């Protein structure tokens, strides 16, 4: 029983259900609009980039403005099969996210660069 202890009537706590939809509301999966090749658009080649390559063992890519550091890391690693030590990005006043990617200490930047195509 225990019919009352407080003067404040409080709404009961009914039982609630879960969607068992007859028809799925939409049709089908919407594929990823960015797989890895949209996260990694093209590398960059400037003197203030090959200085980074030959001194700091770092790569310099350009990525679609909506691309997390985690996403960039995973997508570049999957593309070039190259493990990444860390990643820091920025938004150039143009509107592309320039992504500096510090390669892991075990890889030679001058080797993987001329693998990829850049000078």
């Amino acid at each position: 029983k225990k019919i009352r202890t407080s003067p404040t009537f409080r709404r009961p706590k009914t039982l609630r259900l879960r969607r068992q939809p007859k028809y799925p509301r939409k049709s089908a999966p919407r594929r990823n609009k960015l797989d890895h090749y949209a996260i990694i658009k093209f590398p960059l080649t400037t003197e203030s980039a090959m200085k980074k390559i030959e001194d700091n063992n770092t790569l310099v890519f350009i990525v679609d403005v909506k691309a997390n550091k985690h996403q960039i890391k995973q997508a570049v690693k999957k593309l070039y099969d190259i493990d990444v030590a860390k990643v820091n990005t920025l938004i150039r006043p143009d509107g592309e996210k320039k992504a500096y990617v510090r390669l892991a200490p075990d890889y030679d930047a001058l080797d993987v660069a001329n693998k990829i195509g850049i000078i």
């Binding site: 009352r4 202890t5 009537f9």
Partner: peptide, 12 residues
Amino acid sequence: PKRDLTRFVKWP
């Protein structure tokens, strides 16, 4: 001590 009130509660 708490006791069964049914005369005073603010009914809906």
